[PDB]
Amino acid sequence: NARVPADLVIVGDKLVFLEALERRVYQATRVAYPLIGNID
């Protein structure tokens, strides 16, 4: 055990949880990957 709120939201009669990955990895340089871009 090691306490933390990485914590709990709820969806139905559950709980769920929401604080998601844009707080931990990789700023400011120069190449690319899978993801969003475009589709016909």
Partner 1 sequence: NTLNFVRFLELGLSVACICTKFPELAYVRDGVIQFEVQQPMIARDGPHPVDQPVHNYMVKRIHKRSLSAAFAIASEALSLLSNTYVDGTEIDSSLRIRAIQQMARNLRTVLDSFERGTADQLLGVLLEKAPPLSLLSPINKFQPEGH
Partner 2 sequence: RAIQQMARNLRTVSDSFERGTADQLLGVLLEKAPPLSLLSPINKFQPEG
Residues 8-27 that bind partner 2 (CB under 8 A): 21, 25-26
To the nearest whole angstrom, how small is the minimum distance from the Cβ of residue 22 to partner 1? Answer: 6
Summarize as ranges the residues that interact with partner 1 (CB under 8 A).
22, 25-33
4 binds, among partner 2, partner 1, none (CB under 5 to 8 A by kind): none
Q: What's the CA gap between 7 and 13, in Å, rounded?
A: 16
Q: Say if residues 17 and 7 touch (Cβ distance below 8 Å).
A: yes
Question: What span, in angstroms and rounded, lies between the C-alpha atoms of 29 and 21?
Answer: 19
Q: Residue numbers of the site for partner 2 (CB under 8 A)?
A: 21, 25-26, 33-34
